[PDB]
Amino acid sequence: NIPLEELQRNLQFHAFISYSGHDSFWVKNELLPNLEKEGMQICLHERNFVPGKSIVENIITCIEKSYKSIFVLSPNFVQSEWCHYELYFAHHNLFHEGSNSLILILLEPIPQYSIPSSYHKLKSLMARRTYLEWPKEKSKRGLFWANLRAAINIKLTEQAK
Numbered sequence: 001n002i003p004l005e006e007l008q009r010n011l012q013f014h015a016f017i018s019y020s021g022h023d024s025f026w027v028k029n030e031l032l033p034n035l036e037k038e039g040m041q042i043c044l045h046e047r048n049f050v051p052g053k054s055i056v057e058n059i060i061t062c063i064e065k066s067y068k069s070i071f072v073l074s075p076n077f078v079q080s081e082w083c084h085y086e087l088y089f090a091h092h093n094l095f096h097e098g099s100n101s102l103i104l105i106l107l108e109p110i111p112q113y114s115i116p117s118s119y120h121k122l123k124s125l126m127a128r129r130t131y132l133e134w135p136k137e138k139s140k141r142g143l144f145w146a147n148l149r150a151a152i153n154i155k156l157t158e159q160a161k
Contacts, residue, residue: 001014001038001039001040001149001152001153002014002067002152002153004041004067007067011065011066011067012041012043012065012066013040013041013042013043013048013062013065013066013067014040014041014042014066014067014068014152014153015035015040015042015043015066015067015068015069015070015103015152016042016043016045016062016063016065016066016068016069016070017031017032017042017043017044017070017072018045018059018069018070018071018072018077018081019071019072019077019081020072020074020076020077020079020080020081021080022074022076022080023072023074023076023077023107023108026072026107026134027072031072031105034145034148035148035149035152038149040152041066042066043062043065043066044062045058045059045061045062048062055084056084056088059084060088063094067152067156068100068101068102068103068151068152068156069095069101069102069103070102070103070104070105070152071102071103071104071105072105072107073104073105073106073107073108073110073131074106074107074108074110075108075110075111075114076108077107078110078114078115078119078122079114082119082122085121085122086118086119086120086121086122089121090121095125097124097125097128098128098130099156099157100154100155100156100157101156102125103132103148103151103152104125104126104130104131104132105131105132105133105134105148106131106132106133106134107134108134132144132147132148132151
């Protein structure tokens with residue numbers, strides 16, 4: 001995968017994984033090992049956190065030090081994790097709509113009723129319909145992982161003009 005060294009900037013991780021503690025068993029047993037077991041460096045604001053910093057600072061710090069950002073979407077993420085971003089993306093611009101920067105993983109479908117109308121950047125991001133979906137068919141996995149590593153190692157888009 002991407003050789004963090006040979007990269008322009010001095011990034012410390014291939015990706016930052018943002019999830020909800022509720023989805024912990026899957027991240028810890030499915031996502032992380034199928035990613036780390038293959039040489040990648042992931043930041044978890046929990047493991048790679050820093051004492052004496054706000055929650056937002058730890059997050060905004062991992063986004064910066066890692067090539068890509070992965071969001072494990074689910075009702076629990078929307079429920080207990082998305083505010084931080086909706087609030088941030090409000091007075092800041094970091095993840096465009098269509099770029100390569102953000103990877104959205106749809107771990108569990110999210111009913112339209114659990115999405116506070118106030119969550120604009122979330123509905124938007126979702127609108128573009130580009131998230132990877134955790135397959136129900138065990139058979140369709142591996143295809144997910146492939147698309148996932150592909151998503152991480154794909155090259156970032158430029159700044160155009």
